PDB file of C-alpha atoms and ligand atoms in Angstrom:
ATOM      1  CA  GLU A   2      58.646  56.222 109.744  1.00  0.00           C
ATOM      2  CA  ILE A   3      58.085  59.832 108.923  1.00  0.00           C
ATOM      3  CA  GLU A   4      57.564  60.492 112.694  1.00  0.00           C
ATOM      4  CA  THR A   5      61.302  59.382 113.066  1.00  0.00           C
ATOM      5  CA  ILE A   6      62.458  60.780 110.354  1.00  0.00           C
ATOM      6  CA  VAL A   7      61.118  64.313 110.853  1.00  0.00           C
ATOM      7  CA  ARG A   8      62.509  63.811 114.716  1.00  0.00           C
ATOM      8  CA  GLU A   9      65.874  62.609 114.206  1.00  0.00           C
ATOM      9  CA  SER A  10      65.879  65.576 111.459  1.00  0.00           C
ATOM     10  CA  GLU A  11      64.870  68.299 113.930  1.00  0.00           C
ATOM     11  CA  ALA A  12      68.475  69.938 114.395  1.00  0.00           C
ATOM     12  CA  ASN A  13      68.392  70.601 110.173  1.00  0.00           C
ATOM     13  CA  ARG A  14      65.188  72.284 110.471  1.00  0.00           C
ATOM     14  CA  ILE A  15      66.397  74.611 113.718  1.00  0.00           C
ATOM     15  CA  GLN A  16      69.806  75.708 111.435  1.00  0.00           C
ATOM     16  CA  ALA A  17      67.429  76.539 108.307  1.00  0.00           C
ATOM     17  CA  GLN A  18      64.982  78.397 110.751  1.00  0.00           C
ATOM     18  CA  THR A  19      68.106  81.082 111.674  1.00  0.00           C
ATOM     19  CA  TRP A  20      67.741  82.672 108.439  1.00  0.00           C
ATOM     20  CA  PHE A  21      64.937  84.299 109.151  1.00  0.00           C
ATOM     21  CA  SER A  22      65.226  85.321 113.051  1.00  0.00           C
ATOM     22  CA  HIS A  23      68.456  87.381 112.862  1.00  0.00           C
ATOM     23  CA  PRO A  24      68.743  90.533 111.081  1.00  0.00           C
ATOM     24  CA  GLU A  25      72.140  89.419 108.948  1.00  0.00           C
ATOM     25  CA  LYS A  26      70.701  86.209 108.163  1.00  0.00           C
ATOM     26  CA  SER A  27      67.312  87.406 107.584  1.00  0.00           C
ATOM     27  CA  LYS A  28      68.445  90.083 104.870  1.00  0.00           C
ATOM     28  CA  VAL A  29      70.147  87.199 102.803  1.00  0.00           C
ATOM     29  CA  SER A  30      67.116  84.989 103.012  1.00  0.00           C
ATOM     30  CA  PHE A  31      64.626  87.831 102.212  1.00  0.00           C
ATOM     31  CA  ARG A  32      66.721  89.101  99.219  1.00  0.00           C
ATOM     32  CA  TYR A  33      67.207  85.415  97.930  1.00  0.00           C
ATOM     33  CA  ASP A  34      63.529  85.020  98.211  1.00  0.00           C
ATOM     34  CA  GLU A  35      61.794  87.919  96.765  1.00  0.00           C
ATOM     35  CA  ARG A  36      64.315  87.705  93.905  1.00  0.00           C
ATOM     36  CA  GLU A  37      64.191  84.234  92.947  1.00  0.00           C
ATOM     37  CA  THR A  38      60.799  82.950  94.036  1.00  0.00           C
ATOM     38  CA  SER A  39      58.454  85.853  93.924  1.00  0.00           C
ATOM     39  CA  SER A  40      57.297  84.697  90.274  1.00  0.00           C
ATOM     40  CA  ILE A  41      56.492  80.988  91.835  1.00  0.00           C
ATOM     41  CA  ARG A  42      54.700  82.537  94.705  1.00  0.00           C
ATOM     42  CA  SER A  43      52.326  84.202  91.825  1.00  0.00           C
ATOM     43  CA  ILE A  44      51.963  80.771  90.167  1.00  0.00           C
ATOM     44  CA  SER A  45      51.468  78.991  93.332  1.00  0.00           C
ATOM     45  CA  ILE A  46      48.683  81.275  94.177  1.00  0.00           C
ATOM     46  CA  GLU A  47      46.955  81.545  90.853  1.00  0.00           C
ATOM     47  CA  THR A  48      47.501  77.396  91.427  1.00  0.00           C
ATOM     48  CA  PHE A  49      45.138  77.228  94.379  1.00  0.00           C
ATOM     49  CA  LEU A  50      42.728  80.175  93.056  1.00  0.00           C
ATOM     50  CA  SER A  51      42.094  77.752  90.186  1.00  0.00           C
ATOM     51  CA  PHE A  52      41.698  74.487  91.880  1.00  0.00           C
ATOM     52  CA  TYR A  53      39.386  75.486  94.295  1.00  0.00           C
ATOM     53  CA  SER A  54      37.162  76.978  91.713  1.00  0.00           C
ATOM     54  CA  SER A  55      37.352  73.509  89.592  1.00  0.00           C
ATOM     55  CA  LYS A  56      37.166  71.701  92.830  1.00  0.00           C
ATOM     56  CA  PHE A  57      34.171  73.198  94.855  1.00  0.00           C
ATOM     57  CA  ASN A  58      32.629  75.305  91.696  1.00  0.00           C
ATOM     58  CA  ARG A  59      32.826  78.543  93.916  1.00  0.00           C
ATOM     59  CA  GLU A  60      35.167  80.899  95.213  1.00  0.00           C
ATOM     60  CA  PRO A  61      36.907  80.731  98.411  1.00  0.00           C
ATOM     61  CA  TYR A  62      35.374  83.069 101.033  1.00  0.00           C
ATOM     62  CA  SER A  63      38.755  83.061 103.130  1.00  0.00           C
ATOM     63  CA  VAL A  64      42.434  82.282 103.085  1.00  0.00           C
ATOM     64  CA  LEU A  65      44.707  81.479 105.707  1.00  0.00           C
ATOM     65  CA  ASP A  66      48.549  82.402 104.975  1.00  0.00           C
ATOM     66  CA  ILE A  67      51.103  80.453 107.205  1.00  0.00           C
ATOM     67  CA  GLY A  68      54.395  81.687 107.534  1.00  0.00           C
ATOM     68  CA  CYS A  69      52.630  84.951 105.451  1.00  0.00           C
ATOM     69  CA  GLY A  70      56.423  87.259 105.453  1.00  0.00           C
ATOM     70  CA  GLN A  71      55.628  90.854 104.803  1.00  0.00           C
ATOM     71  CA  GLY A  72      52.082  89.897 103.460  1.00  0.00           C
ATOM     72  CA  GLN A  73      52.798  89.813  99.919  1.00  0.00           C
ATOM     73  CA  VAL A  74      50.065  86.737  99.558  1.00  0.00           C
ATOM     74  CA  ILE A  75      47.699  88.649 101.497  1.00  0.00           C
ATOM     75  CA  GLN A  76      47.863  91.956  99.593  1.00  0.00           C
ATOM     76  CA  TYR A  77      47.841  89.733  96.097  1.00  0.00           C
ATOM     77  CA  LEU A  78      44.338  88.495  97.337  1.00  0.00           C
ATOM     78  CA  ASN A  79      43.127  91.488  98.666  1.00  0.00           C
ATOM     79  CA  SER A  80      43.208  93.319  95.305  1.00  0.00           C
ATOM     80  CA  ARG A  81      42.044  90.285  93.419  1.00  0.00           C
ATOM     81  CA  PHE A  82      38.940  90.039  95.491  1.00  0.00           C
ATOM     82  CA  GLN A  83      36.434  92.704  96.516  1.00  0.00           C
ATOM     83  CA  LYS A  84      35.214  90.791  99.751  1.00  0.00           C
ATOM     84  CA  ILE A  85      37.977  88.251 101.555  1.00  0.00           C
ATOM     85  CA  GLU A  86      38.263  87.190 104.580  1.00  0.00           C
ATOM     86  CA  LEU A  87      42.326  87.131 104.977  1.00  0.00           C
ATOM     87  CA  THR A  88      44.703  86.074 107.415  1.00  0.00           C
ATOM     88  CA  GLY A  89      48.246  85.908 107.734  1.00  0.00           C
ATOM     89  CA  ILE A  90      50.725  84.319 110.326  1.00  0.00           C
ATOM     90  CA  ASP A  91      54.200  84.755 110.829  1.00  0.00           C
ATOM     91  CA  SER A  92      56.900  84.609 114.141  1.00  0.00           C
ATOM     92  CA  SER A  93      58.855  87.370 112.460  1.00  0.00           C
ATOM     93  CA  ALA A  94      58.001  90.356 114.479  1.00  0.00           C
ATOM     94  CA  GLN A  95      59.818  92.632 111.735  1.00  0.00           C
ATOM     95  CA  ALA A  96      58.025  90.403 109.257  1.00  0.00           C
ATOM     96  CA  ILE A  97      54.418  91.190 110.512  1.00  0.00           C
ATOM     97  CA  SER A  98      55.275  95.061 111.162  1.00  0.00           C
ATOM     98  CA  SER A  99      55.865  95.088 107.960  1.00  0.00           C
ATOM     99  CA  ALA A 100      52.779  93.222 106.623  1.00  0.00           C
ATOM    100  CA  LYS A 101      50.580  95.410 108.669  1.00  0.00           C
ATOM    101  CA  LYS A 102      52.152  98.804 106.717  1.00  0.00           C
ATOM    102  CA  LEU A 103      50.172  97.509 103.661  1.00  0.00           C
ATOM    103  CA  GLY A 104      47.091  98.908 105.359  1.00  0.00           C
ATOM    104  CA  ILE A 105      45.331  95.967 104.497  1.00  0.00           C
ATOM    105  CA  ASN A 106      42.266  94.617 105.788  1.00  0.00           C
ATOM    106  CA  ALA A 107      43.422  91.494 106.867  1.00  0.00           C
ATOM    107  CA  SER A 108      44.504  89.824 109.995  1.00  0.00           C
ATOM    108  CA  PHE A 109      48.199  89.627 110.402  1.00  0.00           C
ATOM    109  CA  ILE A 110      49.461  87.603 113.896  1.00  0.00           C
ATOM    110  CA  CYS A 111      52.646  87.276 114.745  1.00  0.00           C
ATOM    111  CA  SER A 112      53.343  84.071 116.870  1.00  0.00           C
ATOM    112  CA  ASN A 113      54.500  80.275 115.760  1.00  0.00           C
ATOM    113  CA  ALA A 114      52.075  78.764 113.617  1.00  0.00           C
ATOM    114  CA  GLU A 115      51.855  75.716 116.338  1.00  0.00           C
ATOM    115  CA  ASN A 116      49.832  78.486 118.344  1.00  0.00           C
ATOM    116  CA  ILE A 117      47.305  79.382 115.411  1.00  0.00           C
ATOM    117  CA  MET A 118      44.134  77.907 117.470  1.00  0.00           C
ATOM    118  CA  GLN A 119      45.132  80.548 120.303  1.00  0.00           C
ATOM    119  CA  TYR A 120      44.455  83.406 117.572  1.00  0.00           C
ATOM    120  CA  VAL A 121      41.938  81.897 115.214  1.00  0.00           C
ATOM    121  CA  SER A 122      38.459  80.053 115.091  1.00  0.00           C
ATOM    122  CA  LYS A 123      36.920  80.456 111.852  1.00  0.00           C
ATOM    123  CA  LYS A 124      37.249  78.018 109.527  1.00  0.00           C
ATOM    124  CA  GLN A 125      39.142  78.598 106.640  1.00  0.00           C
ATOM    125  CA  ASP A 126      38.634  77.847 102.688  1.00  0.00           C
ATOM    126  CA  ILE A 127      42.127  77.714 101.943  1.00  0.00           C
ATOM    127  CA  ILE A 128      45.250  77.250 104.233  1.00  0.00           C
ATOM    128  CA  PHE A 129      48.835  78.430 102.291  1.00  0.00           C
ATOM    129  CA  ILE A 130      51.855  77.103 103.244  1.00  0.00           C
ATOM    130  CA  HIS A 131      54.505  78.441 101.001  1.00  0.00           C
ATOM    131  CA  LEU A 132      57.918  77.467 100.954  1.00  0.00           C
ATOM    132  CA  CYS A 133      58.655  77.586 105.141  1.00  0.00           C
ATOM    133  CA  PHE A 134      57.304  74.330 106.138  1.00  0.00           C
ATOM    134  CA  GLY A 135      60.917  72.623 106.303  1.00  0.00           C
ATOM    135  CA  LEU A 136      61.101  75.591 108.922  1.00  0.00           C
ATOM    136  CA  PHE A 137      58.838  73.942 111.632  1.00  0.00           C
ATOM    137  CA  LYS A 138      60.087  72.356 114.534  1.00  0.00           C
ATOM    138  CA  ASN A 139      56.834  69.928 114.049  1.00  0.00           C
ATOM    139  CA  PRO A 140      55.554  69.982 110.954  1.00  0.00           C
ATOM    140  CA  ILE A 141      53.222  67.094 111.757  1.00  0.00           C
ATOM    141  CA  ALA A 142      51.874  68.811 114.742  1.00  0.00           C
ATOM    142  CA  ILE A 143      51.114  71.882 112.775  1.00  0.00           C
ATOM    143  CA  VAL A 144      49.503  70.364 109.786  1.00  0.00           C
ATOM    144  CA  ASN A 145      47.092  68.207 112.496  1.00  0.00           C
ATOM    145  CA  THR A 146      46.265  71.494 113.724  1.00  0.00           C
ATOM    146  CA  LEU A 147      45.364  73.248 110.708  1.00  0.00           C
ATOM    147  CA  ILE A 148      43.064  70.434 109.575  1.00  0.00           C
ATOM    148  CA  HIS A 149      41.015  71.086 112.833  1.00  0.00           C
ATOM    149  CA  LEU A 150      40.711  74.538 111.243  1.00  0.00           C
ATOM    150  CA  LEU A 151      39.635  73.878 107.486  1.00  0.00           C
ATOM    151  CA  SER A 152      36.101  74.604 106.222  1.00  0.00           C
ATOM    152  CA  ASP A 153      33.445  72.480 104.854  1.00  0.00           C
ATOM    153  CA  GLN A 154      35.133  72.812 101.512  1.00  0.00           C
ATOM    154  CA  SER A 155      38.476  73.187 101.989  1.00  0.00           C
ATOM    155  CA  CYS A 156      42.319  72.716 101.043  1.00  0.00           C
ATOM    156  CA  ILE A 157      45.922  72.966 102.696  1.00  0.00           C
ATOM    157  CA  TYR A 158      48.177  73.720  99.675  1.00  0.00           C
ATOM    158  CA  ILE A 159      51.871  73.374 100.632  1.00  0.00           C
ATOM    159  CA  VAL A 160      54.613  74.231  98.339  1.00  0.00           C
ATOM    160  CA  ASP A 161      58.340  73.181  99.230  1.00  0.00           C
ATOM    161  CA  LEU A 162      61.880  72.306  98.373  1.00  0.00           C
ATOM    162  CA  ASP A 163      62.364  68.888  97.041  1.00  0.00           C
ATOM    163  CA  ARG A 164      65.730  67.470  98.741  1.00  0.00           C
ATOM    164  CA  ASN A 165      66.602  66.039  95.830  1.00  0.00           C
ATOM    165  CA  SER A 166      66.675  69.109  94.065  1.00  0.00           C
ATOM    166  CA  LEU A 167      69.343  70.754  95.860  1.00  0.00           C
ATOM    167  CA  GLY A 168      71.840  70.451  92.786  1.00  0.00           C
ATOM    168  CA  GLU A 169      69.459  72.610  90.762  1.00  0.00           C
ATOM    169  CA  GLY A 170      69.062  74.913  93.852  1.00  0.00           C
ATOM    170  CA  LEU A 171      72.558  76.243  94.231  1.00  0.00           C
ATOM    171  CA  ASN A 172      72.656  77.286  90.575  1.00  0.00           C
ATOM    172  CA  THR A 173      69.908  79.934  91.681  1.00  0.00           C
ATOM    173  CA  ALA A 174      73.026  81.144  94.295  1.00  0.00           C
ATOM    174  CA  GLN A 175      74.483  84.472  93.504  1.00  0.00           C
ATOM    175  CA  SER A 176      77.072  84.812  96.426  1.00  0.00           C
ATOM    176  CA  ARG A 177      78.398  82.746  98.958  1.00  0.00           C
ATOM    177  CA  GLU A 178      76.023  83.961 101.475  1.00  0.00           C
ATOM    178  CA  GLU A 179      73.229  82.628  99.251  1.00  0.00           C
ATOM    179  CA  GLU A 180      75.042  79.130  98.937  1.00  0.00           C
ATOM    180  CA  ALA A 181      75.142  78.829 102.344  1.00  0.00           C
ATOM    181  CA  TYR A 182      71.695  79.780 102.911  1.00  0.00           C
ATOM    182  CA  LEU A 183      69.970  77.417 100.578  1.00  0.00           C
ATOM    183  CA  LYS A 184      72.495  74.721 101.627  1.00  0.00           C
ATOM    184  CA  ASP A 185      70.817  75.029 105.171  1.00  0.00           C
ATOM    185  CA  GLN A 186      67.655  75.256 103.574  1.00  0.00           C
ATOM    186  CA  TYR A 187      67.553  72.106 101.598  1.00  0.00           C
ATOM    187  CA  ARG A 188      69.334  70.294 104.495  1.00  0.00           C
ATOM    188  CA  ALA A 189      66.226  70.665 106.367  1.00  0.00           C
ATOM    189  CA  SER A 190      63.993  69.609 103.183  1.00  0.00           C
ATOM    190  CA  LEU A 191      61.824  66.453 102.511  1.00  0.00           C
ATOM    191  CA  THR A 192      61.974  63.652  99.714  1.00  0.00           C
ATOM    192  CA  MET A 193      59.181  63.256  97.664  1.00  0.00           C
ATOM    193  CA  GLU A 194      58.248  60.152  98.931  1.00  0.00           C
ATOM    194  CA  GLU A 195      58.310  61.593 102.589  1.00  0.00           C
ATOM    195  CA  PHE A 196      56.513  64.193 102.160  1.00  0.00           C
ATOM    196  CA  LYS A 197      53.861  61.845 100.156  1.00  0.00           C
ATOM    197  CA  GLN A 198      54.138  59.474 103.638  1.00  0.00           C
ATOM    198  CA  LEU A 199      53.909  62.992 105.840  1.00  0.00           C
ATOM    199  CA  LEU A 200      50.443  63.774 104.250  1.00  0.00           C
ATOM    200  CA  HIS A 201      49.528  60.096 104.300  1.00  0.00           C
ATOM    201  CA  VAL A 202      49.976  60.031 108.135  1.00  0.00           C
ATOM    202  CA  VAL A 203      47.735  63.611 108.760  1.00  0.00           C
ATOM    203  CA  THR A 204      45.103  62.419 106.372  1.00  0.00           C
ATOM    204  CA  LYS A 205      43.776  58.888 106.642  1.00  0.00           C
ATOM    205  CA  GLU A 206      42.923  59.909 110.531  1.00  0.00           C
ATOM    206  CA  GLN A 207      40.253  62.337 108.814  1.00  0.00           C
ATOM    207  CA  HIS A 208      36.721  61.960 107.768  1.00  0.00           C
ATOM    208  CA  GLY A 209      36.200  63.455 104.543  1.00  0.00           C
ATOM    209  CA  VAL A 210      39.676  64.458 104.167  1.00  0.00           C
ATOM    210  CA  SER A 211      41.789  63.330 100.678  1.00  0.00           C
ATOM    211  CA  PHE A 212      45.560  64.304  99.624  1.00  0.00           C
ATOM    212  CA  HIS A 213      47.263  64.802  96.380  1.00  0.00           C
ATOM    213  CA  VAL A 214      51.497  64.959  95.998  1.00  0.00           C
ATOM    214  CA  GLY A 215      53.622  65.629  93.089  1.00  0.00           C
ATOM    215  CA  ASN A 216      56.866  67.775  91.213  1.00  0.00           C
ATOM    216  CA  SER A 217      54.758  69.020  88.737  1.00  0.00           C
ATOM    217  CA  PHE A 218      55.011  72.346  88.251  1.00  0.00           C
ATOM    218  CA  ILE A 219      51.611  72.982  87.938  1.00  0.00           C
ATOM    219  CA  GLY A 220      50.189  72.148  91.504  1.00  0.00           C
ATOM    220  CA  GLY A 221      52.265  68.664  91.340  1.00  0.00           C
ATOM    221  CA  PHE A 222      49.185  67.070  89.053  1.00  0.00           C
ATOM    222  CA  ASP A 223      50.730  64.972  86.215  1.00  0.00           C
ATOM    223  CA  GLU A 224      50.218  66.287  82.984  1.00  0.00           C
ATOM    224  CA  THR A 225      47.934  63.858  81.865  1.00  0.00           C
ATOM    225  CA  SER A 226      45.887  64.225  85.005  1.00  0.00           C
ATOM    226  CA  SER A 227      42.452  65.963  85.350  1.00  0.00           C
ATOM    227  CA  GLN A 228      42.996  68.638  87.802  1.00  0.00           C
ATOM    228  CA  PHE A 229      46.112  69.574  84.975  1.00  0.00           C
ATOM    229  CA  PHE A 230      43.637  70.309  82.207  1.00  0.00           C
ATOM    230  CA  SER A 231      41.384  72.416  84.332  1.00  0.00           C
ATOM    231  CA  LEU A 232      44.707  74.259  85.486  1.00  0.00           C
ATOM    232  CA  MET A 233      46.228  74.480  81.970  1.00  0.00           C
ATOM    233  CA  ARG A 234      42.858  75.996  80.621  1.00  0.00           C
ATOM    234  CA  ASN A 235      42.659  78.659  83.213  1.00  0.00           C
ATOM    235  CA  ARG A 236      43.256  82.270  82.213  1.00  0.00           C
ATOM    236  CA  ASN A 237      44.048  83.753  85.352  1.00  0.00           C
ATOM    237  CA  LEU A 238      47.245  80.953  85.695  1.00  0.00           C
ATOM    238  CA  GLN A 239      47.965  81.391  82.028  1.00  0.00           C
ATOM    239  CA  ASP A 240      48.201  84.786  82.648  1.00  0.00           C
ATOM    240  CA  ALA A 241      50.650  84.010  85.694  1.00  0.00           C
ATOM    241  CA  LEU A 242      52.718  81.447  83.684  1.00  0.00           C
ATOM    242  CA  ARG A 243      53.491  84.457  81.015  1.00  0.00           C
ATOM    243  CA  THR A 244      55.152  86.992  83.286  1.00  0.00           C
ATOM    244  CA  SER A 245      56.435  85.322  86.208  1.00  0.00           C
ATOM    245  CA  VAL A 246      59.715  83.669  84.500  1.00  0.00           C
ATOM    246  CA  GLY A 247      59.110  84.946  80.920  1.00  0.00           C
ATOM    247  CA  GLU A 248      62.492  87.020  81.037  1.00  0.00           C
ATOM    248  CA  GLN A 249      64.896  86.347  78.187  1.00  0.00           C
ATOM    249  CA  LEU A 250      68.245  85.157  79.699  1.00  0.00           C
ATOM    250  CA  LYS A 251      67.838  81.620  77.404  1.00  0.00           C
ATOM    251  CA  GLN A 252      67.172  78.971  80.064  1.00  0.00           C
ATOM    252  CA  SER A 253      65.298  79.413  83.604  1.00  0.00           C
ATOM    253  CA  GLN A 254      67.300  77.258  86.203  1.00  0.00           C
ATOM    254  CA  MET A 255      64.410  75.729  87.502  1.00  0.00           C
ATOM    255  CA  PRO A 256      64.376  73.421  90.839  1.00  0.00           C
ATOM    256  CA  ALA A 257      61.610  71.169  91.294  1.00  0.00           C
ATOM    257  CA  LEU A 258      59.691  71.674  94.015  1.00  0.00           C
ATOM    258  CA  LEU A 259      57.148  69.713  95.998  1.00  0.00           C
ATOM    259  CA  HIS A 260      53.039  70.311  95.552  1.00  0.00           C
ATOM    260  CA  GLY A 261      51.078  68.516  98.565  1.00  0.00           C
ATOM    261  CA  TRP A 262      47.164  69.296  98.681  1.00  0.00           C
ATOM    262  CA  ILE A 263      45.003  68.106 101.753  1.00  0.00           C
ATOM    263  CA  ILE A 264      41.447  68.599 100.521  1.00  0.00           C
ATOM    264  CA  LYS A 265      38.191  68.710 102.597  1.00  0.00           C
ATOM    265  CA  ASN A 266      34.638  67.842 101.066  1.00  0.00           C
ATOM    266  CA  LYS A 267      32.639  67.384 104.088  1.00  0.00           C
ATOM    267  CA  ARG A 268      29.458  65.088 102.913  1.00  0.00           C
ATOM    268  CA  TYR A 269      26.384  66.149 105.976  1.00  0.00           C
ATOM    269  CA  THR A 270      23.707  64.069 106.830  1.00  0.00           C
TER     270      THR A 270
HETATM  271  N1  SAH B   1      57.119  78.246 113.496  1.00  0.00           N
HETATM  272  C1  SAH B   1      56.679  79.272 112.868  1.00  0.00           C
HETATM  273  N2  SAH B   1      55.491  80.092 112.501  1.00  0.00           N
HETATM  274  C2  SAH B   1      55.280  80.945 112.053  1.00  0.00           C
HETATM  275  N3  SAH B   1      56.467  81.442 110.892  1.00  0.00           N
HETATM  276  C3  SAH B   1      57.611  80.801 110.609  1.00  0.00           C
HETATM  277  C4  SAH B   1      57.733  79.875 111.531  1.00  0.00           C
HETATM  278  N4  SAH B   1      58.674  79.734 111.390  1.00  0.00           N
HETATM  279  C5  SAH B   1      59.054  80.294 110.436  1.00  0.00           C
HETATM  280  N5  SAH B   1      58.360  81.491 109.810  1.00  0.00           N
HETATM  281  C6  SAH B   1      58.522  82.393 109.137  1.00  0.00           C
HETATM  282  O1  SAH B   1      58.452  81.580 107.460  1.00  0.00           O
HETATM  283  C7  SAH B   1      59.035  82.341 106.834  1.00  0.00           C
HETATM  284  C8  SAH B   1      59.395  81.687 106.072  1.00  0.00           C
HETATM  285  S1  SAH B   1      60.630  82.779 104.239  1.00  0.00           S
HETATM  286  C9  SAH B   1      58.618  83.355 103.755  1.00  0.00           C
HETATM  287  C10 SAH B   1      57.842  82.419 102.890  1.00  0.00           C
HETATM  288  C11 SAH B   1      56.435  82.612 102.392  1.00  0.00           C
HETATM  289  N6  SAH B   1      55.252  82.159 102.543  1.00  0.00           N
HETATM  290  C12 SAH B   1      56.731  83.104 101.161  1.00  0.00           C
HETATM  291  O2  SAH B   1      56.558  82.418  99.909  1.00  0.00           O
HETATM  292  O3  SAH B   1      57.631  83.985 100.755  1.00  0.00           O
HETATM  293  C13 SAH B   1      59.419  83.494 107.084  1.00  0.00           C
HETATM  294  O4  SAH B   1      58.685  85.222 107.365  1.00  0.00           O
HETATM  295  C14 SAH B   1      59.571  83.033 108.811  1.00  0.00           C
HETATM  296  O5  SAH B   1      59.528  84.045 109.962  1.00  0.00           O
END
């Protein structure tokens, strides 16, 4: 079913991606994303760091950022850890050029995520796909490729738009062009059920691999579930929650996002 949904929806994902590949449209998307999603990005990073520590009882050694933009995630991670192997990939040359100007000890690659194996061979502890999964022409193929790059103790963490959150998404727009941008992005997005089906398809074909999907603000983990408690106790995630969307303004206008994990814990003989 999901393979069909993905294929028939391909034009919608092509249209969404125009907002990142043309200079004028890219100004609109960059402004919106940095104004509205920067806080979310911090929360998402602290979420995966906290999850990784709780799940594997160690810190990650390597992180790969898919659709890394101007390298904001990699910069955040670079200041957090003294030693960590960092890689970012993005198909926008302008984004990668900007990322390289940060002067960080990290590898930035300009290519379609499809081609990652031609650039990266070392296994990754965390592969992060933040607010860009709906832009890929072939998302099933991408994830299958990335699973091959996962280390012994690893996860793919995907955060993306929920198709059903369109109304709330539009409330955040501050211009008609932002409305147009968001409409195009949401048209490319999946429902929660479709997202869950997608992760089911890519994981049950893999040894030592489980998955989790949810709408909960904290990593999609239900507020009666186990990982939720570990996360809510985490000092770093708590810090991020305070000053991310901790302004006045009375209300926040928060569209619910999809949160997906592909978790690998290889058992050796
Ligand atoms: N096939 C592909 N491979 C790699 N990057 C892609 C891609 N399609 C789109 N992108 C990139 O995905 C990004 C979406 S916007 C930036 C998302 C970033 N992860 C963040 O959370 O802020 C753009 O920089 C765009 O150039």
